[PDB]
Design a protein around this nucleic acid. Sequence first.
DNA 1: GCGTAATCTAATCAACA
DNA 2: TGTTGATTAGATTACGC
Lengths: 56, 56
Amino acid sequence: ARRKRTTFNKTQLEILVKSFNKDPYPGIGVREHLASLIQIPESRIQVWFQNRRARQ
Amino acid sequence: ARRKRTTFNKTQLEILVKSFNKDPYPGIGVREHLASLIQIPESRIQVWFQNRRARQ
DNA sequence: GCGTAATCTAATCAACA
DNA sequence: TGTTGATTAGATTACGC
């Protein structure tokens, strides 16, 4: 079975979109910073960035 | 920009290889169980399983 | 129901002994 | 220098709202 679908609120999405507009390929440091900031596991943020680059 | 390379000891590798021989496609439950068991983040275990299925 | 999170493979890079 | 963990680009499948 798959994990439960991670849900992002308005603030988390806004922060992630700003970070994406700054750099679409964030290193491990910035990814972990975003993880601690919006309280979302770093793996989920990496998946989000991959999907975001995929739609764009 | 990459994360530090995850290092596995003998026991972690043994448990992961046993789980792989049992099921090469573990669900989220089994992955999180292995994560809690060998104390390694679930994303690292998913990456390890992907690489293992890739080289075999 | 749509958007998008999650997952898999295939290919490539690089780092820690 | 080698093994193998880490990353990314595509295709998918399938929940959360």
